[PDB]
mmCIF file of all heavy atoms in Angstrom:
data_model
loop_
_atom_site.group_PDB
_atom_site.id
_atom_site.type_symbol
_atom_site.label_atom_id
_atom_site.label_comp_id
_atom_site.label_asym_id
_atom_site.label_seq_id
_atom_site.Cartn_x
_atom_site.Cartn_y
_atom_site.Cartn_z
ATOM 1 N N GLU A 1 0.805 -1.214 0.000
ATOM 2 C CA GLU A 1 0.000 0.000 0.000
ATOM 3 C C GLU A 1 0.841 1.268 0.000
ATOM 4 O O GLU A 1 0.275 2.365 -0.033
ATOM 5 C CB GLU A 1 -0.956 -0.001 1.195
ATOM 6 C CG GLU A 1 -0.335 0.426 2.505
ATOM 7 C CD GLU A 1 -1.322 0.364 3.650
ATOM 8 O OE1 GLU A 1 -2.540 0.325 3.381
ATOM 9 O OE2 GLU A 1 -0.884 0.351 4.819
ATOM 10 N N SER A 2 2.165 1.150 0.036
ATOM 11 C CA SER A 2 3.054 2.300 -0.075
ATOM 12 C C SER A 2 3.723 2.420 -1.434
ATOM 13 O O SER A 2 3.817 3.523 -1.973
ATOM 14 C CB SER A 2 4.132 2.240 1.012
ATOM 15 O OG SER A 2 4.863 1.029 0.933
ATOM 16 N N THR A 3 4.195 1.314 -2.004
ATOM 17 C CA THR A 3 4.885 1.351 -3.283
ATOM 18 C C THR A 3 3.882 1.287 -4.434
ATOM 19 O O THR A 3 2.685 1.061 -4.242
ATOM 20 C CB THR A 3 5.897 0.212 -3.375
ATOM 21 O OG1 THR A 3 6.859 0.508 -4.395
ATOM 22 C CG2 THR A 3 5.199 -1.092 -3.713
ATOM 23 N N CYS A 4 4.380 1.488 -5.652
ATOM 24 C CA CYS A 4 3.553 1.489 -6.850
ATOM 25 C C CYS A 4 3.463 0.085 -7.433
ATOM 26 O O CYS A 4 4.271 -0.789 -7.104
ATOM 27 C CB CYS A 4 4.107 2.449 -7.904
ATOM 28 S SG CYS A 4 3.434 2.191 -9.561
ATOM 29 N N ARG A 5 2.471 -0.125 -8.300
ATOM 30 C CA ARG A 5 2.240 -1.458 -8.847
ATOM 31 C C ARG A 5 3.018 -1.677 -10.140
ATOM 32 O O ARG A 5 3.503 -2.786 -10.397
ATOM 33 C CB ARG A 5 0.742 -1.676 -9.068
ATOM 34 C CG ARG A 5 0.390 -2.469 -10.314
ATOM 35 C CD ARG A 5 -1.116 -2.652 -10.450
ATOM 36 N NE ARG A 5 -1.859 -1.406 -10.284
ATOM 37 C CZ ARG A 5 -1.788 -0.366 -11.105
ATOM 38 N NH1 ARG A 5 -1.033 -0.387 -12.191
ATOM 39 N NH2 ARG A 5 -2.504 0.722 -10.835
ATOM 40 N N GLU A 6 3.163 -0.637 -10.960
ATOM 41 C CA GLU A 6 3.774 -0.816 -12.277
ATOM 42 C C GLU A 6 5.297 -0.843 -12.179
ATOM 43 O O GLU A 6 5.935 -1.843 -12.519
ATOM 44 C CB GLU A 6 3.297 0.285 -13.231
ATOM 45 C CG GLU A 6 3.894 0.221 -14.636
ATOM 46 C CD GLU A 6 5.234 0.924 -14.754
ATOM 47 O OE1 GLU A 6 5.487 1.860 -13.969
ATOM 48 O OE2 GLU A 6 6.031 0.541 -15.634
ATOM 49 N N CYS A 7 5.895 0.251 -11.716
ATOM 50 C CA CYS A 7 7.346 0.341 -11.614
ATOM 51 C C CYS A 7 7.883 -0.168 -10.284
ATOM 52 O O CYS A 7 9.099 -0.323 -10.143
ATOM 53 C CB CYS A 7 7.804 1.787 -11.835
ATOM 54 S SG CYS A 7 6.767 3.038 -11.051
ATOM 55 N N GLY A 8 7.015 -0.434 -9.311
ATOM 56 C CA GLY A 8 7.455 -0.952 -8.032
ATOM 57 C C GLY A 8 8.198 0.065 -7.192
ATOM 58 O O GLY A 8 8.803 -0.283 -6.173
ATOM 59 N N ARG A 9 8.162 1.326 -7.606
ATOM 60 C CA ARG A 9 8.817 2.396 -6.874
ATOM 61 C C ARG A 9 7.855 3.006 -5.861
ATOM 62 O O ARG A 9 6.633 2.941 -6.010
ATOM 63 C CB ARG A 9 9.327 3.469 -7.836
ATOM 64 C CG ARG A 9 10.429 2.986 -8.763
ATOM 65 C CD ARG A 9 11.205 4.145 -9.361
ATOM 66 N NE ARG A 9 11.171 5.329 -8.513
ATOM 67 C CZ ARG A 9 12.064 5.602 -7.571
ATOM 68 N NH1 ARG A 9 13.085 4.795 -7.332
ATOM 69 N NH2 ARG A 9 11.930 6.712 -6.851
ATOM 70 N N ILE A 10 8.426 3.593 -4.809
ATOM 71 C CA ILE A 10 7.607 4.213 -3.777
ATOM 72 C C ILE A 10 6.866 5.408 -4.362
ATOM 73 O O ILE A 10 7.356 6.092 -5.270
ATOM 74 C CB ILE A 10 8.460 4.634 -2.568
ATOM 75 C CG1 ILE A 10 9.801 5.198 -3.033
ATOM 76 C CG2 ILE A 10 8.671 3.457 -1.628
ATOM 77 C CD1 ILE A 10 10.732 5.535 -1.897
ATOM 78 N N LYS A 11 5.674 5.667 -3.831
ATOM 79 C CA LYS A 11 4.858 6.772 -4.310
ATOM 80 C C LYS A 11 5.315 8.084 -3.686
ATOM 81 O O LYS A 11 4.509 8.817 -3.104
ATOM 82 C CB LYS A 11 3.384 6.514 -4.001
ATOM 83 C CG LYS A 11 2.780 5.376 -4.804
ATOM 84 C CD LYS A 11 1.281 5.294 -4.599
ATOM 85 C CE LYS A 11 0.936 4.408 -3.416
ATOM 86 N NZ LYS A 11 -0.076 5.044 -2.530
ATOM 87 N N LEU A 12 6.604 8.389 -3.809
ATOM 88 C CA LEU A 12 7.200 9.573 -3.211
ATOM 89 C C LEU A 12 7.879 10.413 -4.283
ATOM 90 O O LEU A 12 8.443 9.885 -5.246
ATOM 91 C CB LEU A 12 8.223 9.194 -2.131
ATOM 92 C CG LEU A 12 7.712 8.607 -0.812
ATOM 93 C CD1 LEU A 12 8.675 8.933 0.316
ATOM 94 C CD2 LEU A 12 6.318 9.111 -0.481
ATOM 95 N N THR A 13 7.819 11.731 -4.109
ATOM 96 C CA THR A 13 8.485 12.643 -5.023
ATOM 97 C C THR A 13 9.995 12.606 -4.804
ATOM 98 O O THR A 13 10.488 12.194 -3.751
ATOM 99 C CB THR A 13 7.967 14.069 -4.842
ATOM 100 O OG1 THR A 13 8.739 14.736 -3.836
ATOM 101 C CG2 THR A 13 6.505 14.051 -4.423
ATOM 102 N N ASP A 14 10.731 13.045 -5.827
ATOM 103 C CA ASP A 14 12.187 12.951 -5.783
ATOM 104 C C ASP A 14 12.777 13.825 -4.680
ATOM 105 O O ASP A 14 13.671 13.386 -3.949
ATOM 106 C CB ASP A 14 12.779 13.329 -7.141
ATOM 107 C CG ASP A 14 14.293 13.341 -7.131
ATOM 108 O OD1 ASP A 14 14.898 12.282 -7.402
ATOM 109 O OD2 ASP A 14 14.881 14.408 -6.854
ATOM 110 N N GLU A 15 12.297 15.063 -4.548
ATOM 111 C CA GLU A 15 12.820 15.943 -3.506
ATOM 112 C C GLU A 15 12.424 15.454 -2.117
ATOM 113 O O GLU A 15 13.207 15.565 -1.163
ATOM 114 C CB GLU A 15 12.347 17.378 -3.747
ATOM 115 C CG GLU A 15 10.837 17.576 -3.695
ATOM 116 C CD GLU A 15 10.336 17.908 -2.303
ATOM 117 O OE1 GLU A 15 11.169 18.219 -1.427
ATOM 118 O OE2 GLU A 15 9.107 17.859 -2.087
ATOM 119 N N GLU A 16 11.211 14.913 -1.983
ATOM 120 C CA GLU A 16 10.810 14.303 -0.723
ATOM 121 C C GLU A 16 11.692 13.105 -0.400
ATOM 122 O O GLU A 16 12.088 12.904 0.754
ATOM 123 C CB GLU A 16 9.336 13.903 -0.790
ATOM 124 C CG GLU A 16 8.909 12.851 0.213
ATOM 125 C CD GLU A 16 7.460 12.437 0.030
ATOM 126 O OE1 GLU A 16 7.039 12.240 -1.129
ATOM 127 O OE2 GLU A 16 6.742 12.314 1.045
ATOM 128 N N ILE A 17 12.028 12.310 -1.417
ATOM 129 C CA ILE A 17 12.947 11.194 -1.222
ATOM 130 C C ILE A 17 14.304 11.703 -0.756
ATOM 131 O O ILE A 17 14.930 11.117 0.134
ATOM 132 C CB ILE A 17 13.059 10.363 -2.514
ATOM 133 C CG1 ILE A 17 11.856 9.429 -2.652
ATOM 134 C CG2 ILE A 17 14.353 9.563 -2.537
ATOM 135 C CD1 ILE A 17 11.561 9.021 -4.078
ATOM 136 N N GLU A 18 14.779 12.804 -1.342
ATOM 137 C CA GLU A 18 16.079 13.349 -0.964
ATOM 138 C C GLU A 18 16.083 13.822 0.487
ATOM 139 O O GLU A 18 17.014 13.528 1.248
ATOM 140 C CB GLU A 18 16.452 14.495 -1.905
ATOM 141 C CG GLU A 18 17.852 15.052 -1.700
ATOM 142 C CD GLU A 18 18.858 13.989 -1.305
ATOM 143 O OE1 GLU A 18 19.136 13.097 -2.132
ATOM 144 O OE2 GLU A 18 19.373 14.050 -0.170
ATOM 145 N N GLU A 19 15.046 14.559 0.889
ATOM 146 C CA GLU A 19 15.010 15.056 2.262
ATOM 147 C C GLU A 19 14.856 13.912 3.259
ATOM 148 O O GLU A 19 15.465 13.934 4.339
ATOM 149 C CB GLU A 19 13.897 16.095 2.430
ATOM 150 C CG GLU A 19 12.486 15.587 2.218
ATOM 151 C CD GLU A 19 11.825 15.146 3.507
ATOM 152 O OE1 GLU A 19 12.423 15.355 4.582
ATOM 153 O OE2 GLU A 19 10.708 14.592 3.448
ATOM 154 N N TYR A 20 14.066 12.891 2.910
ATOM 155 C CA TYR A 20 13.940 11.736 3.788
ATOM 156 C C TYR A 20 15.250 10.966 3.875
ATOM 157 O O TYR A 20 15.598 10.450 4.941
ATOM 158 C CB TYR A 20 12.803 10.833 3.316
ATOM 159 C CG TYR A 20 11.468 11.211 3.912
ATOM 160 C CD1 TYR A 20 10.365 11.447 3.106
ATOM 161 C CD2 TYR A 20 11.314 11.340 5.285
ATOM 162 C CE1 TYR A 20 9.144 11.796 3.651
ATOM 163 C CE2 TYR A 20 10.098 11.689 5.839
ATOM 164 C CZ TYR A 20 9.017 11.916 5.017
ATOM 165 O OH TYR A 20 7.804 12.262 5.563
ATOM 166 N N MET A 21 15.993 10.885 2.769
ATOM 167 C CA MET A 21 17.323 10.286 2.806
ATOM 168 C C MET A 21 18.232 11.051 3.752
ATOM 169 O O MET A 21 18.991 10.455 4.526
ATOM 170 C CB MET A 21 17.931 10.261 1.403
ATOM 171 C CG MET A 21 18.727 9.008 1.080
ATOM 172 S SD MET A 21 17.758 7.495 1.171
ATOM 173 C CE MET A 21 16.722 7.706 -0.273
ATOM 174 N N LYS A 22 18.181 12.381 3.692
ATOM 175 C CA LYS A 22 19.032 13.178 4.568
ATOM 176 C C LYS A 22 18.682 12.960 6.036
ATOM 177 O O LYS A 22 19.578 12.796 6.872
ATOM 178 C CB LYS A 22 18.940 14.659 4.205
ATOM 179 C CG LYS A 22 19.692 15.026 2.936
ATOM 180 C CD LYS A 22 19.521 16.496 2.589
ATOM 181 C CE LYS A 22 18.112 16.800 2.116
ATOM 182 N NZ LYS A 22 18.091 17.868 1.079
ATOM 183 N N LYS A 23 17.391 12.948 6.375
ATOM 184 C CA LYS A 23 17.044 12.828 7.790
ATOM 185 C C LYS A 23 17.174 11.401 8.313
ATOM 186 O O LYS A 23 17.437 11.212 9.506
ATOM 187 C CB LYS A 23 15.629 13.340 8.065
ATOM 188 C CG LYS A 23 14.566 12.862 7.107
ATOM 189 C CD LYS A 23 13.185 13.278 7.590
ATOM 190 C CE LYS A 23 13.136 14.760 7.927
ATOM 191 N NZ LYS A 23 13.096 15.616 6.712
ATOM 192 N N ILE A 24 16.989 10.389 7.462
ATOM 193 C CA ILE A 24 16.969 9.011 7.947
ATOM 194 C C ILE A 24 18.362 8.581 8.393
ATOM 195 O O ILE A 24 18.519 7.869 9.391
ATOM 196 C CB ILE A 24 16.389 8.063 6.879
ATOM 197 C CG1 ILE A 24 16.188 6.664 7.454
ATOM 198 C CG2 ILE A 24 17.293 7.966 5.662
ATOM 199 C CD1 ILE A 24 14.985 5.954 6.879
ATOM 200 N N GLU A 25 19.393 9.005 7.661
ATOM 201 C CA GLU A 25 20.759 8.695 8.067
ATOM 202 C C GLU A 25 21.137 9.467 9.323
ATOM 203 O O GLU A 25 21.856 8.952 10.187
ATOM 204 C CB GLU A 25 21.726 9.002 6.923
ATOM 205 C CG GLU A 25 23.198 8.880 7.285
ATOM 206 C CD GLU A 25 23.789 10.185 7.779
ATOM 207 O OE1 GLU A 25 23.254 11.253 7.418
ATOM 208 O OE2 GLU A 25 24.784 10.141 8.531
ATOM 209 N N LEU A 26 20.663 10.704 9.439
ATOM 210 C CA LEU A 26 20.944 11.517 10.612
ATOM 211 C C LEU A 26 20.319 10.876 11.842
ATOM 212 O O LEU A 26 19.095 10.732 11.924
ATOM 213 C CB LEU A 26 20.413 12.938 10.390
ATOM 214 C CG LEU A 26 20.456 14.078 11.422
ATOM 215 C CD1 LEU A 26 20.055 15.368 10.729
ATOM 216 C CD2 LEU A 26 19.550 13.865 12.628
ATOM 217 N N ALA A 27 21.169 10.490 12.795
ATOM 218 C CA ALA A 27 20.737 9.886 14.056
ATOM 219 C C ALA A 27 19.891 8.636 13.817
ATOM 220 O O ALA A 27 18.828 8.454 14.412
ATOM 221 C CB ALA A 27 19.986 10.901 14.921
ATOM 222 N N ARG A 28 20.380 7.761 12.940
ATOM 223 C CA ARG A 28 19.698 6.498 12.680
ATOM 224 C C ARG A 28 19.850 5.499 13.818
ATOM 225 O O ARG A 28 19.233 4.429 13.764
ATOM 226 C CB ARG A 28 20.213 5.879 11.379
ATOM 227 C CG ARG A 28 21.483 5.059 11.539
ATOM 228 C CD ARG A 28 22.058 4.653 10.190
ATOM 229 N NE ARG A 28 21.208 3.687 9.503
ATOM 230 C CZ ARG A 28 20.531 3.941 8.391
ATOM 231 N NH1 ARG A 28 20.579 5.127 7.809
ATOM 232 N NH2 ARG A 28 19.786 2.981 7.852
ATOM 233 N N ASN A 29 20.658 5.816 14.832
ATOM 234 C CA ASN A 29 20.904 4.876 15.921
ATOM 235 C C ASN A 29 19.627 4.568 16.696
ATOM 236 O O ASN A 29 19.300 3.399 16.934
ATOM 237 C CB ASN A 29 21.978 5.437 16.852
ATOM 238 C CG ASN A 29 21.823 6.926 17.085
ATOM 239 O OD1 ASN A 29 20.746 7.486 16.891
ATOM 240 N ND2 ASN A 29 22.902 7.574 17.504
ATOM 241 N N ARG A 30 18.894 5.601 17.103
ATOM 242 C CA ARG A 30 17.696 5.390 17.904
ATOM 243 C C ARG A 30 16.615 4.696 17.085
ATOM 244 O O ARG A 30 16.375 5.037 15.924
ATOM 245 C CB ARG A 30 17.172 6.717 18.449
ATOM 246 C CG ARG A 30 18.250 7.715 18.830
ATOM 247 C CD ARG A 30 17.672 9.116 18.953
ATOM 248 N NE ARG A 30 18.633 10.151 18.593
ATOM 249 C CZ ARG A 30 18.307 11.396 18.272
ATOM 250 N NH1 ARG A 30 17.047 11.797 18.254
ATOM 251 N NH2 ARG A 30 19.270 12.260 17.962
ATOM 252 N N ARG A 31 15.962 3.710 17.701
ATOM 253 C CA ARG A 31 14.938 2.943 17.003
ATOM 254 C C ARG A 31 13.622 3.704 16.898
ATOM 255 O O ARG A 31 12.934 3.618 15.875
ATOM 256 C CB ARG A 31 14.711 1.608 17.708
ATOM 257 C CG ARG A 31 15.629 0.494 17.250
ATOM 258 C CD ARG A 31 15.273 -0.797 17.956
ATOM 259 N NE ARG A 31 13.829 -0.944 18.088
ATOM 260 C CZ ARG A 31 13.210 -1.266 19.214
ATOM 261 N NH1 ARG A 31 13.877 -1.450 20.339
ATOM 262 N NH2 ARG A 31 11.886 -1.396 19.212
ATOM 263 N N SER A 32 13.250 4.440 17.948
ATOM 264 C CA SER A 32 11.931 5.066 17.985
ATOM 265 C C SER A 32 11.785 6.119 16.892
ATOM 266 O O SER A 32 10.786 6.141 16.165
ATOM 267 C CB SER A 32 11.687 5.682 19.361
ATOM 268 O OG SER A 32 12.592 6.742 19.608
ATOM 269 N N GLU A 33 12.775 7.004 16.763
ATOM 270 C CA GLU A 33 12.714 8.019 15.717
ATOM 271 C C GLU A 33 12.770 7.381 14.335
ATOM 272 O O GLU A 33 12.138 7.867 13.389
ATOM 273 C CB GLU A 33 13.847 9.029 15.897
ATOM 274 C CG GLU A 33 15.231 8.414 15.895
ATOM 275 C CD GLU A 33 15.853 8.399 14.515
ATOM 276 O OE1 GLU A 33 15.887 9.464 13.865
ATOM 277 O OE2 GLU A 33 16.299 7.320 14.074
ATOM 278 N N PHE A 34 13.524 6.288 14.202
ATOM 279 C CA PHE A 34 13.561 5.561 12.939
ATOM 280 C C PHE A 34 12.174 5.059 12.560
ATOM 281 O O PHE A 34 11.730 5.230 11.418
ATOM 282 C CB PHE A 34 14.545 4.399 13.048
ATOM 283 C CG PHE A 34 14.794 3.688 11.755
ATOM 284 C CD1 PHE A 34 15.286 4.371 10.659
ATOM 285 C CD2 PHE A 34 14.542 2.333 11.637
ATOM 286 C CE1 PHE A 34 15.520 3.716 9.469
ATOM 287 C CE2 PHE A 34 14.774 1.675 10.449
ATOM 288 C CZ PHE A 34 15.262 2.368 9.363
ATOM 289 N N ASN A 35 11.464 4.461 13.519
ATOM 290 C CA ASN A 35 10.119 3.972 13.243
ATOM 291 C C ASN A 35 9.162 5.121 12.960
ATOM 292 O O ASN A 35 8.250 4.987 12.138
ATOM 293 C CB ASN A 35 9.617 3.126 14.411
ATOM 294 C CG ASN A 35 10.468 1.897 14.642
ATOM 295 O OD1 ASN A 35 11.424 1.644 13.909
ATOM 296 N ND2 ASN A 35 10.123 1.120 15.662
ATOM 297 N N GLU A 36 9.347 6.258 13.633
ATOM 298 C CA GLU A 36 8.500 7.416 13.354
ATOM 299 C C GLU A 36 8.694 7.909 11.925
ATOM 300 O O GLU A 36 7.719 8.225 11.230
ATOM 301 C CB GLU A 36 8.789 8.536 14.353
ATOM 302 C CG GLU A 36 8.418 8.205 15.788
ATOM 303 C CD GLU A 36 7.386 7.099 15.884
ATOM 304 O OE1 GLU A 36 6.187 7.384 15.685
ATOM 305 O OE2 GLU A 36 7.774 5.944 16.161
ATOM 306 N N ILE A 37 9.945 7.979 11.470
ATOM 307 C CA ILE A 37 10.213 8.383 10.091
ATOM 308 C C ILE A 37 9.620 7.372 9.118
ATOM 309 O O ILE A 37 9.059 7.742 8.078
ATOM 310 C CB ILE A 37 11.725 8.566 9.871
ATOM 311 C CG1 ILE A 37 12.266 9.661 10.790
ATOM 312 C CG2 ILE A 37 12.018 8.910 8.425
ATOM 313 C CD1 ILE A 37 13.761 9.603 10.985
ATOM 314 N N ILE A 38 9.737 6.081 9.438
ATOM 315 C CA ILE A 38 9.162 5.049 8.579
ATOM 316 C C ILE A 38 7.651 5.219 8.474
ATOM 317 O O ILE A 38 7.075 5.128 7.384
ATOM 318 C CB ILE A 38 9.541 3.650 9.096
ATOM 319 C CG1 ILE A 38 11.037 3.399 8.911
ATOM 320 C CG2 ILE A 38 8.736 2.580 8.385
ATOM 321 C CD1 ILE A 38 11.548 3.752 7.536
ATOM 322 N N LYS A 39 6.986 5.467 9.605
ATOM 323 C CA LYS A 39 5.538 5.649 9.591
ATOM 324 C C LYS A 39 5.142 6.891 8.804
ATOM 325 O O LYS A 39 4.145 6.881 8.073
ATOM 326 C CB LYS A 39 5.001 5.728 11.019
ATOM 327 C CG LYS A 39 5.164 4.447 11.816
ATOM 328 C CD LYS A 39 4.359 3.311 11.212
ATOM 329 C CE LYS A 39 2.886 3.670 11.110
ATOM 330 N NZ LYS A 39 2.345 4.154 12.408
ATOM 331 N N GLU A 40 5.901 7.980 8.953
ATOM 332 C CA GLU A 40 5.607 9.186 8.186
ATOM 333 C C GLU A 40 5.730 8.929 6.689
ATOM 334 O O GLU A 40 4.861 9.337 5.906
ATOM 335 C CB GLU A 40 6.538 10.319 8.614
ATOM 336 C CG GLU A 40 5.878 11.684 8.642
ATOM 337 C CD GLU A 40 6.885 12.815 8.634
ATOM 338 O OE1 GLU A 40 7.365 13.179 7.541
ATOM 339 O OE2 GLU A 40 7.200 13.340 9.723
ATOM 340 N N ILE A 41 6.799 8.245 6.277
ATOM 341 C CA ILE A 41 6.977 7.920 4.865
ATOM 342 C C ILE A 41 5.836 7.040 4.377
ATOM 343 O O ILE A 41 5.308 7.234 3.275
ATOM 344 C CB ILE A 41 8.345 7.252 4.638
ATOM 345 C CG1 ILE A 41 9.469 8.278 4.784
ATOM 346 C CG2 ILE A 41 8.402 6.592 3.272
ATOM 347 C CD1 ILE A 41 10.792 7.674 5.188
ATOM 348 N N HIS A 42 5.439 6.058 5.188
ATOM 349 C CA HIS A 42 4.344 5.171 4.810
ATOM 350 C C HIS A 42 3.047 5.945 4.620
ATOM 351 O O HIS A 42 2.310 5.707 3.657
ATOM 352 C CB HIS A 42 4.171 4.085 5.869
ATOM 353 C CG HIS A 42 2.970 3.220 5.658
ATOM 354 N ND1 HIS A 42 2.199 2.755 6.702
ATOM 355 C CD2 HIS A 42 2.409 2.729 4.528
ATOM 356 C CE1 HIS A 42 1.214 2.017 6.224
ATOM 357 N NE2 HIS A 42 1.319 1.986 4.908
ATOM 358 N N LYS A 43 2.748 6.873 5.529
ATOM 359 C CA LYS A 43 1.522 7.656 5.412
ATOM 360 C C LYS A 43 1.547 8.535 4.168
ATOM 361 O O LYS A 43 0.554 8.617 3.431
ATOM 362 C CB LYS A 43 1.320 8.503 6.668
ATOM 363 C CG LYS A 43 -0.038 9.175 6.746
ATOM 364 C CD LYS A 43 0.014 10.430 7.602
ATOM 365 C CE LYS A 43 0.938 11.472 6.993
ATOM 366 N NZ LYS A 43 0.759 11.584 5.520
ATOM 367 N N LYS A 44 2.678 9.199 3.914
ATOM 368 C CA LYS A 44 2.775 10.051 2.732
ATOM 369 C C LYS A 44 2.651 9.235 1.451
ATOM 370 O O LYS A 44 2.056 9.695 0.470
ATOM 371 C CB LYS A 44 4.086 10.836 2.745
ATOM 372 C CG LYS A 44 4.276 11.698 3.978
ATOM 373 C CD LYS A 44 3.445 12.964 3.899
ATOM 374 C CE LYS A 44 3.984 13.905 2.839
ATOM 375 N NZ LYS A 44 5.420 14.222 3.063
ATOM 376 N N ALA A 45 3.216 8.028 1.433
ATOM 377 C CA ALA A 45 3.067 7.169 0.264
ATOM 378 C C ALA A 45 1.624 6.713 0.092
ATOM 379 O O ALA A 45 1.111 6.667 -1.031
ATOM 380 C CB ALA A 45 4.001 5.965 0.376
#
């Protein structure tokens, strides 16, 4: 329900992908914030 059916790519814009890439690596150690970012990406997709 997050990725696309045809190309199999996430339903996210390129700049949104870039900003999420920047924040996800930043302080990736903590699990809770990681899961929060994952949930946000899932909702936006």
Side-chain angles (χ1 to χ4, degrees):
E1 81 182 342
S2 57
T3 199
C4 164
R5 143 179 49 65
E6 179 274 333
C7 41
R9 294 199 26 91
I10 39 184
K11 291 188 271 134
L12 289 208
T13 89
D14 176 89
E15 62 90 13
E16 159 184 44
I17 281 156
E18 186 35 66
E19 64 93 7
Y20 271 127
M21 219 60 71
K22 285 178 289 214
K23 46 172 50 75
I24 188 146
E25 173 269 335
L26 177 170
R28 84 189 292 112
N29 40 21
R30 324 163 211 161
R31 272 183 39 229
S32 65
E33 58 92 52
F34 187 59
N35 298 358
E36 294 338 281
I37 299 161
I38 291 312
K39 295 296 303 308
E40 217 198 83
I41 288 154
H42 173 218
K43 190 206 63 43
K44 303 283 290 305

